[PDB]
Short mmCIF file of C-alpha atoms and ligand atoms in Angstrom, two decimals:
data_model
loop_
_atom_site.label_atom_id
_atom_site.label_comp_id
_atom_site.label_asym_id
_atom_site.label_seq_id
_atom_site.Cartn_x
_atom_site.Cartn_y
_atom_site.Cartn_z
CA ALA A 16 100.41 106.02 156.64
CA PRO A 17 98.52 103.31 154.74
CA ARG A 18 100.65 100.14 154.28
CA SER A 19 99.39 99.91 150.68
CA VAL A 20 98.36 102.44 147.99
CA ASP A 21 97.29 101.93 144.35
CA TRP A 22 96.13 105.07 142.59
CA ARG A 23 95.17 103.01 139.53
CA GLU A 24 92.10 101.68 141.33
CA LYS A 25 91.10 105.31 142.09
CA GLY A 26 91.02 106.63 138.49
CA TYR A 27 94.26 108.67 138.54
CA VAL A 28 96.23 106.67 135.95
CA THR A 29 95.92 106.26 132.19
CA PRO A 30 96.77 103.02 130.37
CA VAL A 31 100.41 102.13 129.77
CA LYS A 32 101.97 103.87 126.75
CA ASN A 33 105.03 103.04 124.66
CA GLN A 34 107.94 105.41 124.00
CA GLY A 35 109.10 103.38 121.00
CA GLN A 36 112.62 104.03 119.79
CA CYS A 37 113.06 107.47 121.44
CA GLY A 38 114.60 108.53 124.77
CA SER A 39 111.40 110.25 125.88
CA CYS A 40 110.92 108.39 129.22
CA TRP A 41 111.01 111.78 131.01
CA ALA A 42 108.05 113.03 128.95
CA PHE A 43 105.94 109.94 129.82
CA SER A 44 106.90 110.31 133.51
CA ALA A 45 105.86 113.98 133.42
CA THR A 46 102.56 113.38 131.61
CA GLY A 47 101.70 110.60 134.05
CA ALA A 48 102.23 112.85 137.06
CA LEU A 49 100.26 115.69 135.51
CA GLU A 50 97.42 113.28 134.44
CA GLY A 51 97.23 112.32 138.10
CA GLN A 52 97.17 115.92 139.45
CA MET A 53 94.65 117.11 136.82
CA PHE A 54 92.36 114.19 137.82
CA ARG A 55 92.74 115.12 141.50
CA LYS A 56 91.68 118.65 140.62
CA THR A 57 88.94 118.14 137.97
CA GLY A 58 87.82 114.52 138.32
CA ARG A 59 88.56 113.95 134.59
CA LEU A 60 91.30 111.57 133.44
CA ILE A 61 92.64 112.81 130.11
CA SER A 62 95.69 111.42 128.36
CA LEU A 63 98.26 114.20 127.80
CA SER A 64 100.69 114.77 124.91
CA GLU A 65 104.24 113.58 125.34
CA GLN A 66 104.89 114.81 121.78
CA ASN A 67 104.10 118.36 122.91
CA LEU A 68 106.78 118.04 125.61
CA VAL A 69 109.31 116.41 123.26
CA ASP A 70 108.85 119.08 120.58
CA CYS A 71 108.47 122.23 122.69
CA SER A 72 110.48 122.02 125.97
CA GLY A 73 113.99 122.72 124.61
CA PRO A 74 114.12 126.22 126.17
CA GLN A 75 113.60 124.65 129.63
CA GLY A 76 116.58 122.31 129.09
CA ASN A 77 115.05 119.16 127.52
CA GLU A 78 116.67 117.37 124.52
CA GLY A 79 113.75 115.52 122.94
CA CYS A 80 114.51 111.91 122.13
CA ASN A 81 118.05 112.46 123.47
CA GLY A 82 116.80 112.84 127.03
CA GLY A 83 115.36 115.25 129.54
CA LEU A 84 113.96 115.85 133.03
CA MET A 85 110.42 115.77 134.41
CA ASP A 86 111.03 119.03 136.28
CA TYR A 87 112.03 120.73 133.01
CA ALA A 88 108.76 119.40 131.54
CA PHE A 89 106.72 120.77 134.45
CA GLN A 90 108.44 124.13 134.01
CA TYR A 91 107.51 124.09 130.32
CA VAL A 92 103.83 123.58 131.05
CA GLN A 93 103.92 126.48 133.48
CA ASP A 94 105.88 128.73 131.04
CA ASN A 95 103.59 127.70 128.18
CA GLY A 96 100.36 128.09 130.16
CA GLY A 97 99.04 124.78 128.86
CA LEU A 98 99.61 121.27 127.41
CA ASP A 99 97.73 119.57 124.58
CA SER A 100 95.83 116.30 124.88
CA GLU A 101 97.36 113.11 123.48
CA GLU A 102 94.41 112.79 121.09
CA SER A 103 95.09 116.25 119.58
CA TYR A 104 98.91 116.04 119.47
CA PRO A 105 99.77 112.35 119.04
CA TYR A 106 103.07 110.62 119.89
CA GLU A 107 105.37 109.95 116.88
CA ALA A 108 108.56 108.78 118.68
CA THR A 109 110.69 111.49 117.05
CA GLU A 110 111.19 115.25 117.44
CA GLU A 111 109.05 117.58 115.32
CA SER A 112 108.54 121.35 115.15
CA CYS A 113 106.57 122.68 118.09
CA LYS A 114 102.89 122.54 117.13
CA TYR A 115 101.38 123.50 120.49
CA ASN A 116 97.85 124.83 119.96
CA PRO A 117 95.99 126.38 122.96
CA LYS A 118 92.74 125.21 121.40
CA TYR A 119 93.52 121.67 122.54
CA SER A 120 95.09 122.53 125.91
CA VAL A 121 93.61 120.36 128.66
CA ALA A 122 96.16 120.69 131.47
CA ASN A 123 98.30 123.31 133.15
CA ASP A 124 100.57 123.59 136.13
CA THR A 125 101.75 126.17 138.62
CA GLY A 126 105.18 124.75 139.45
CA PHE A 127 106.52 121.55 140.95
CA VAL A 128 107.81 120.13 144.21
CA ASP A 129 111.05 118.19 144.59
CA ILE A 130 110.65 115.50 147.25
CA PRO A 131 113.41 115.01 149.86
CA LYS A 132 115.81 112.20 148.91
CA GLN A 133 114.24 109.81 151.40
CA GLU A 134 112.04 106.77 150.79
CA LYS A 135 109.93 107.85 153.80
CA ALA A 136 109.25 111.22 152.19
CA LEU A 137 108.43 109.57 148.86
CA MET A 138 105.99 107.24 150.65
CA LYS A 139 104.26 110.22 152.32
CA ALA A 140 104.03 111.98 148.95
CA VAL A 141 102.58 108.97 147.19
CA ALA A 142 100.00 108.56 149.95
CA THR A 143 98.94 112.21 150.09
CA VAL A 144 99.45 113.64 146.59
CA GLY A 145 99.00 110.97 143.97
CA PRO A 146 101.31 109.42 141.34
CA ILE A 147 104.88 110.81 141.58
CA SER A 148 107.56 111.22 138.87
CA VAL A 149 110.82 109.39 139.73
CA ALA A 150 114.18 108.61 138.17
CA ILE A 151 115.57 105.08 138.43
CA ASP A 152 118.57 103.12 137.30
CA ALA A 153 116.85 100.90 134.67
CA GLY A 154 120.05 99.94 132.79
CA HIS A 155 120.28 96.25 133.71
CA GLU A 156 119.24 93.07 131.89
CA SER A 157 117.20 91.96 134.98
CA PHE A 158 114.96 95.01 134.37
CA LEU A 159 114.38 94.18 130.62
CA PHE A 160 113.41 90.67 131.57
CA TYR A 161 111.31 91.62 134.62
CA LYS A 162 108.02 89.67 134.70
CA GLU A 163 106.80 89.30 138.31
CA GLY A 164 107.55 89.67 141.99
CA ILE A 165 109.64 92.36 143.68
CA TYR A 166 112.52 93.58 141.52
CA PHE A 167 115.93 93.80 143.18
CA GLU A 168 119.21 94.08 141.26
CA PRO A 169 122.41 93.97 143.37
CA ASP A 170 124.19 96.05 140.73
CA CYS A 171 121.58 98.86 140.80
CA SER A 172 122.86 102.36 141.53
CA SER A 173 121.18 104.71 144.02
CA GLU A 174 123.07 107.67 142.48
CA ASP A 175 123.25 107.15 138.70
CA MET A 176 119.67 107.05 137.34
CA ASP A 177 118.91 107.01 133.60
CA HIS A 178 115.15 106.36 133.31
CA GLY A 179 112.09 108.46 134.22
CA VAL A 180 109.02 106.50 135.46
CA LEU A 181 105.92 107.01 137.61
CA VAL A 182 105.23 105.65 141.09
CA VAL A 183 101.52 104.96 141.34
CA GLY A 184 101.52 103.19 144.69
CA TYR A 185 103.28 100.83 147.00
CA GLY A 186 102.59 97.79 149.13
CA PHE A 187 103.84 94.42 150.26
CA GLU A 188 103.75 90.71 149.44
CA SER A 189 101.47 88.67 151.72
CA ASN A 190 108.91 92.48 151.42
CA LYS A 191 107.76 95.93 150.40
CA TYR A 192 107.60 97.43 146.93
CA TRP A 193 106.88 100.55 144.94
CA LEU A 194 104.31 100.14 142.16
CA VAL A 195 105.94 101.68 139.10
CA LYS A 196 104.36 102.46 135.71
CA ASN A 197 106.85 102.25 132.82
CA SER A 198 106.52 103.48 129.22
CA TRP A 199 107.70 100.37 127.38
CA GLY A 200 104.22 99.16 126.46
CA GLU A 201 101.85 96.75 128.16
CA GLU A 202 103.77 93.70 126.94
CA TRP A 203 106.77 94.58 129.14
CA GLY A 204 106.83 93.56 132.77
CA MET A 205 103.48 93.05 134.56
CA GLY A 206 101.08 94.76 132.20
CA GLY A 207 103.74 97.48 131.72
CA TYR A 208 104.41 97.85 135.46
CA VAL A 209 107.10 96.72 137.87
CA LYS A 210 107.15 96.21 141.62
CA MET A 211 110.47 97.67 142.74
CA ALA A 212 112.06 96.99 146.12
CA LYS A 213 110.94 99.52 148.74
CA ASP A 214 112.88 100.46 151.91
CA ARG A 215 115.94 98.60 150.66
CA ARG A 216 118.60 101.36 150.69
CA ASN A 217 116.85 103.57 148.14
CA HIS A 218 117.09 100.78 145.59
CA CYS A 219 117.88 101.90 142.02
CA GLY A 220 117.71 105.52 143.20
CA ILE A 221 113.90 105.73 143.24
CA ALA A 222 113.78 108.44 145.92
CA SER A 223 116.84 110.42 144.61
CA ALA A 224 115.03 112.64 142.07
CA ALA A 225 111.31 112.45 142.77
CA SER A 226 108.89 115.25 142.01
CA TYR A 227 105.34 116.21 141.13
CA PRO A 228 103.59 119.20 139.48
CA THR A 229 101.37 121.61 141.36
CA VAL A 230 98.09 122.53 139.59
CA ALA B 170 86.25 94.81 121.27
CA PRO B 171 87.77 97.78 123.15
CA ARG B 172 85.60 100.90 123.50
CA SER B 173 88.57 103.05 122.41
CA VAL B 174 91.36 102.39 119.85
CA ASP B 175 94.06 104.79 118.55
CA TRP B 176 96.73 103.25 116.35
CA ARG B 177 98.72 106.51 116.25
CA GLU B 178 100.21 105.98 119.69
CA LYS B 179 101.23 102.40 118.70
CA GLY B 180 103.43 103.48 115.78
CA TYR B 181 101.18 102.55 112.87
CA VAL B 182 100.57 106.06 111.46
CA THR B 183 102.73 108.59 109.62
CA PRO B 184 102.32 112.36 110.11
CA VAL B 185 99.54 114.11 108.28
CA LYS B 186 100.17 114.88 104.62
CA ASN B 187 98.69 117.42 102.21
CA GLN B 188 97.34 116.47 98.81
CA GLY B 189 97.38 120.14 97.66
CA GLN B 190 95.31 120.97 94.57
CA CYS B 191 94.89 117.43 93.27
CA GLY B 192 92.04 114.92 93.72
CA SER B 193 94.47 112.34 95.13
CA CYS B 194 92.68 111.64 98.45
CA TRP B 195 92.39 107.96 97.40
CA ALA B 196 96.18 107.68 97.13
CA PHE B 197 96.78 109.11 100.61
CA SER B 198 94.16 106.81 102.03
CA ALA B 199 95.77 103.83 100.34
CA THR B 200 99.32 104.70 101.43
CA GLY B 201 98.02 105.18 104.96
CA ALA B 202 96.46 101.73 105.09
CA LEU B 203 99.56 100.14 103.62
CA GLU B 204 101.91 102.08 105.99
CA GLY B 205 99.90 100.55 108.83
CA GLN B 206 99.93 96.98 107.46
CA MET B 207 103.64 97.15 106.59
CA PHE B 208 104.24 98.31 110.17
CA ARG B 209 102.18 95.39 111.49
CA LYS B 210 104.23 92.93 109.41
CA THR B 211 107.72 94.43 109.82
CA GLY B 212 107.80 96.90 112.75
CA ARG B 213 109.07 99.63 110.41
CA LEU B 214 106.96 102.74 109.68
CA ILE B 215 107.99 104.13 106.29
CA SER B 216 106.08 106.80 104.42
CA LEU B 217 104.95 105.56 101.02
CA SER B 218 104.70 107.34 97.68
CA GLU B 219 101.30 108.72 96.73
CA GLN B 220 102.92 110.05 93.56
CA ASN B 221 103.80 106.49 92.53
CA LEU B 222 100.10 105.59 92.80
CA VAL B 223 98.97 108.75 90.98
CA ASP B 224 101.39 108.22 88.09
CA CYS B 225 101.20 104.48 87.66
CA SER B 226 97.83 102.99 88.72
CA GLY B 227 95.88 103.98 85.55
CA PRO B 228 95.75 100.32 84.34
CA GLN B 229 93.98 99.32 87.58
CA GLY B 230 91.38 102.07 86.96
CA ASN B 231 92.67 105.18 88.73
CA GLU B 232 92.56 108.68 87.18
CA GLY B 233 95.37 110.45 89.06
CA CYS B 234 94.34 113.94 90.25
CA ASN B 235 90.87 113.34 88.78
CA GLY B 236 90.00 110.62 91.26
CA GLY B 237 90.54 106.99 92.15
CA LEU B 238 89.76 104.22 94.61
CA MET B 239 91.85 102.67 97.35
CA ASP B 240 91.15 99.11 96.14
CA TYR B 241 92.50 100.00 92.69
CA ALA B 242 95.64 101.28 94.38
CA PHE B 243 95.98 98.03 96.39
CA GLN B 244 95.50 96.12 93.12
CA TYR B 245 98.29 98.15 91.54
CA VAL B 246 100.75 97.41 94.34
CA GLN B 247 99.95 93.70 93.99
CA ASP B 248 100.21 93.66 90.17
CA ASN B 249 103.37 95.76 90.30
CA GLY B 250 105.11 93.73 93.02
CA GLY B 251 105.98 96.86 94.98
CA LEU B 252 105.60 100.55 95.91
CA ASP B 253 108.35 103.14 96.27
CA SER B 254 108.96 105.13 99.41
CA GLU B 255 107.80 108.72 99.71
CA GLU B 256 111.37 109.90 100.06
CA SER B 257 112.42 108.17 96.79
CA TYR B 258 109.36 109.20 94.74
CA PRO B 259 108.17 112.58 96.09
CA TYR B 260 104.71 114.04 95.77
CA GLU B 261 104.16 116.73 93.11
CA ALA B 262 100.33 117.19 93.31
CA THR B 263 100.08 116.58 89.54
CA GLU B 264 100.24 113.52 87.25
CA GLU B 265 103.65 112.61 85.81
CA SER B 266 104.96 109.70 83.76
CA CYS B 267 105.34 106.45 85.69
CA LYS B 268 108.80 106.48 87.29
CA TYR B 269 108.38 103.38 89.46
CA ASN B 270 111.79 101.86 90.31
CA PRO B 271 112.00 98.52 92.24
CA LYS B 272 115.30 99.55 93.82
CA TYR B 273 113.23 101.88 96.07
CA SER B 274 110.25 99.60 96.72
CA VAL B 275 109.57 99.33 100.42
CA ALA B 276 106.01 97.90 100.44
CA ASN B 277 104.07 95.09 98.81
CA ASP B 278 100.70 93.47 99.16
CA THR B 279 99.20 90.10 98.35
CA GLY B 280 95.62 91.25 97.89
CA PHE B 281 93.10 93.29 99.86
CA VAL B 282 89.94 92.76 101.88
CA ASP B 283 86.64 94.64 101.64
CA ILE B 284 84.96 95.02 105.00
CA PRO B 285 81.27 94.16 105.46
CA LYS B 286 79.20 97.29 104.86
CA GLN B 287 78.23 97.84 108.52
CA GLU B 288 79.75 100.02 111.26
CA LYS B 289 79.94 96.97 113.54
CA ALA B 290 82.21 95.19 111.05
CA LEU B 291 84.28 98.37 110.60
CA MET B 292 84.79 98.54 114.38
CA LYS B 293 86.00 94.92 114.47
CA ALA B 294 88.44 95.58 111.61
CA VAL B 295 89.86 98.72 113.20
CA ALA B 296 90.30 96.90 116.50
CA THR B 297 91.98 93.80 115.00
CA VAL B 298 93.69 94.91 111.74
CA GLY B 299 94.94 98.48 112.06
CA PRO B 300 94.15 101.68 110.15
CA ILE B 301 91.39 101.12 107.59
CA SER B 302 90.82 102.92 104.26
CA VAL B 303 87.27 104.36 104.04
CA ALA B 304 85.26 106.58 101.74
CA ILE B 305 83.13 109.42 103.18
CA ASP B 306 80.82 112.18 101.94
CA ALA B 307 83.10 115.18 102.66
CA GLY B 308 81.20 117.61 100.42
CA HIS B 309 79.61 119.81 103.09
CA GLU B 310 80.78 123.18 104.41
CA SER B 311 80.58 121.85 107.99
CA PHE B 312 83.26 119.24 107.23
CA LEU B 313 85.23 121.59 105.07
CA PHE B 314 85.41 123.79 108.25
CA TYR B 315 85.55 121.30 111.24
CA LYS B 316 87.85 122.08 114.23
CA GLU B 317 86.84 119.93 117.25
CA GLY B 318 84.26 117.64 118.84
CA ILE B 319 82.28 114.97 117.06
CA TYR B 320 81.36 115.80 113.47
CA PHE B 321 77.73 115.24 112.43
CA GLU B 322 76.17 116.69 109.26
CA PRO B 323 72.42 116.08 108.68
CA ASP B 324 72.78 116.53 104.90
CA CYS B 325 75.57 113.92 104.73
CA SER B 326 74.86 110.94 102.46
CA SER B 327 75.75 107.26 103.02
CA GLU B 328 76.07 106.35 99.32
CA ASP B 329 77.46 109.54 97.73
CA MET B 330 80.96 109.27 99.18
CA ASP B 331 83.54 111.41 97.38
CA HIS B 332 86.57 111.44 99.65
CA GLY B 333 89.04 108.70 100.70
CA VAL B 334 90.48 108.89 104.22
CA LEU B 335 91.90 106.62 106.91
CA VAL B 336 90.24 105.47 110.10
CA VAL B 337 92.99 105.18 112.72
CA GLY B 338 90.80 104.46 115.70
CA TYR B 339 87.58 105.16 117.54
CA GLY B 340 86.29 106.19 120.95
CA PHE B 341 83.89 108.34 122.92
CA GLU B 342 83.85 111.72 124.65
CA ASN B 343 78.66 109.83 122.05
CA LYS B 344 80.97 107.80 119.84
CA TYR B 345 83.34 108.71 117.02
CA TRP B 346 85.68 107.36 114.41
CA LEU B 347 89.14 108.95 114.53
CA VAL B 348 89.88 109.83 110.91
CA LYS B 349 93.18 110.97 109.34
CA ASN B 350 92.63 113.37 106.44
CA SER B 351 95.13 114.57 103.80
CA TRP B 352 94.45 118.31 103.91
CA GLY B 353 97.52 119.14 106.04
CA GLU B 354 97.89 119.64 109.80
CA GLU B 355 96.21 123.06 109.87
CA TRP B 356 92.87 121.48 108.94
CA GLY B 357 90.69 120.09 111.70
CA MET B 358 92.37 118.72 114.81
CA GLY B 359 95.98 118.50 113.73
CA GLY B 360 94.76 117.06 110.39
CA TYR B 361 92.18 114.68 111.99
CA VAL B 362 88.42 114.60 112.47
CA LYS B 363 86.27 112.72 114.97
CA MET B 364 83.31 111.50 112.85
CA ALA B 365 79.99 110.35 114.30
CA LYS B 366 80.03 106.56 114.90
CA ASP B 367 76.94 104.36 115.12
CA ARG B 368 74.67 107.12 113.82
CA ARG B 369 73.16 106.01 110.49
CA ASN B 370 76.44 105.01 108.79
CA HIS B 371 77.16 108.74 108.93
CA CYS B 372 78.69 110.14 105.73
CA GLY B 373 78.90 106.52 104.47
CA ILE B 374 81.99 105.67 106.49
CA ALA B 375 81.35 101.88 106.49
CA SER B 376 80.07 101.76 102.87
CA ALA B 377 83.44 101.22 101.14
CA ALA B 378 86.07 100.21 103.67
CA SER B 379 89.07 98.04 102.90
CA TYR B 380 92.62 97.22 103.82
CA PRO B 381 95.58 95.57 102.04
CA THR B 382 96.80 92.11 102.99
CA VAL B 383 100.57 92.06 103.26
C1 W28 C 566 114.68 107.51 129.06
O1 W28 C 566 113.94 107.39 127.87
C2 W28 C 566 115.88 108.42 128.85
C3 W28 C 566 116.97 107.57 128.18
C4 W28 C 566 118.26 108.29 127.80
C5 W28 C 566 118.09 109.36 126.75
C6 W28 C 566 119.27 109.16 125.80
N1 W28 C 566 119.77 107.83 126.09
C7 W28 C 566 119.28 107.31 127.21
O2 W28 C 566 119.57 106.20 127.67
N2 W28 C 566 116.40 109.01 130.08
C8 W28 C 566 116.38 110.33 130.31
O3 W28 C 566 115.93 111.15 129.53
C9 W28 C 566 116.95 110.78 131.65
C10 W28 C 566 115.80 110.71 132.65
C11 W28 C 566 116.16 111.21 134.03
C12 W28 C 566 114.93 111.41 134.87
C13 W28 C 566 117.18 110.33 134.72
N3 W28 C 566 117.57 112.08 131.54
C14 W28 C 566 118.59 112.27 130.68
O4 W28 C 566 119.18 111.34 130.12
C15 W28 C 566 119.03 113.63 130.34
C16 W28 C 566 119.83 114.03 129.30
C17 W28 C 566 119.96 115.43 129.38
C18 W28 C 566 120.63 116.41 128.63
C19 W28 C 566 120.52 117.73 129.00
C20 W28 C 566 119.77 118.10 130.12
C21 W28 C 566 119.10 117.18 130.89
C22 W28 C 566 119.20 115.84 130.51
N4 W28 C 566 118.63 114.72 131.06
C1 W28 C 567 89.61 113.18 96.77
O1 W28 C 567 90.86 113.79 96.52
C2 W28 C 567 88.91 112.80 95.49
C3 W28 C 567 88.27 114.08 94.96
C4 W28 C 567 87.51 113.98 93.63
C5 W28 C 567 88.37 113.67 92.40
C6 W28 C 567 88.29 114.95 91.57
N1 W28 C 567 87.08 115.59 92.06
C7 W28 C 567 86.83 115.31 93.32
O2 W28 C 567 86.24 116.05 94.16
N2 W28 C 567 87.91 111.74 95.58
C8 W28 C 567 88.06 110.59 94.94
O3 W28 C 567 89.05 110.32 94.25
C9 W28 C 567 86.95 109.58 95.19
C10 W28 C 567 87.31 108.76 96.43
C11 W28 C 567 86.41 107.56 96.71
C12 W28 C 567 86.96 106.65 97.81
C13 W28 C 567 85.03 108.08 97.02
N3 W28 C 567 86.81 108.77 93.99
C14 W28 C 567 86.38 109.27 92.81
O4 W28 C 567 85.97 110.41 92.65
C15 W28 C 567 86.58 108.37 91.68
C16 W28 C 567 86.82 107.02 91.62
C17 W28 C 567 87.00 106.67 90.26
C18 W28 C 567 87.26 105.47 89.58
C19 W28 C 567 87.40 105.50 88.21
C20 W28 C 567 87.25 106.69 87.50
C21 W28 C 567 86.95 107.88 88.13
C22 W28 C 567 86.84 107.86 89.52
N4 W28 C 567 86.59 108.88 90.40
#
């Protein structure tokens, strides 16, 4: 497989967004992975509505700003037969009534694939598919304060993840890393991204709950 | 400047409101611009009271449901030393007695700036300041009935503006202003309209733009 991948250079990834004061990480993770797969299919990069997911995906098991799962979000888009653009259904960092309108649907999906709980499998998927939704353990001060280099936190869990993010690539320092897009704004980390330790015992659980939508 | 800006995703903009059967557009535009500048200053997004402006800004020149201007509303907030929250001083779509109460003030301003009367200066303000109050010519059936794409009306005028609204951003699909209206969420695109940008100061969008200084 390639030793390095960065889907950002290839047009698959929208700018970093900001969840604000709302536990909607899972919705940002899901929209990032679907943005990637819709670009793969159509050649158009269009920002998708996390608000739509937050407001409408309760039946599939999601709890809005109180948490949720990317796979539940992918199931919603399939069940719903669409997902609105960001520009039509803007993010408000709270839960509102479902206002889905098919008029402004710009994405869809046909299911999802859960990747085997192996960093090797995740690497293959990143190389072959595009950006991939992943859960990490993000609940450490070292992660708030991350600015540069490869992130490693000896107290990270490989089993107890709490944060949904998007792997957009991987590589190495000229000491391997995953390239991860967060949803804490561009001021956090390296332009909103973090290089997380790769092939270091599934560090922070990055390969434990990885998935992507089919389109 | 960036080629695209949308302050809604950055926490500067409240949900779309509905003026109902009252010519209070100017008050919704003003509260929008002040909600954005108060967010810029404090990091808190709090919906402000249009009714407080409708009821109380007569001395600064406004005429309640019979019309008004955003700058007169910004002058009121300055003169008054405050503006009540929406939740404290709810909207009734009619003019009442002034019930302003400082206990519930959650906004202030120190003044206000008028933007140079060019779309280039408007673009610079939107990119650097936040949501901007603007006046447009909305009195065309096309606008009345917009749903998607970029709005362009040949019979639109650049000096006969009659409607106050809020520019929250701009971009391209062929450029547009992203404009928050106050006709509820069922109108337009969730309550918004993409208005032609850099096409003959279309509908007079850069003719009377301003924002409060906080
Ligand atoms: C990230 O914004 C979010 C933060 C938590 C929400 C409430 N407090 C938090 O710290 N994390 C999540 O939403 C995680 C993401 C996964 C991928 C690890 N999922 C959940 O917390 C969660 C809650 C919940 C309740 C019912 C069903 C599923 C479910 N998932
Ligand atoms: C939008 O709600 C409002 C609609 C008019 C008022 C009643 N009839 C209408 O159609 N439009 C306004 O309030 C406009 C907005 C500006 C920014 C163009 N302003 C006026 O009509 C206006 C300003 C003003 C100042 C003093 C006295 C009267 C007066 N009217």
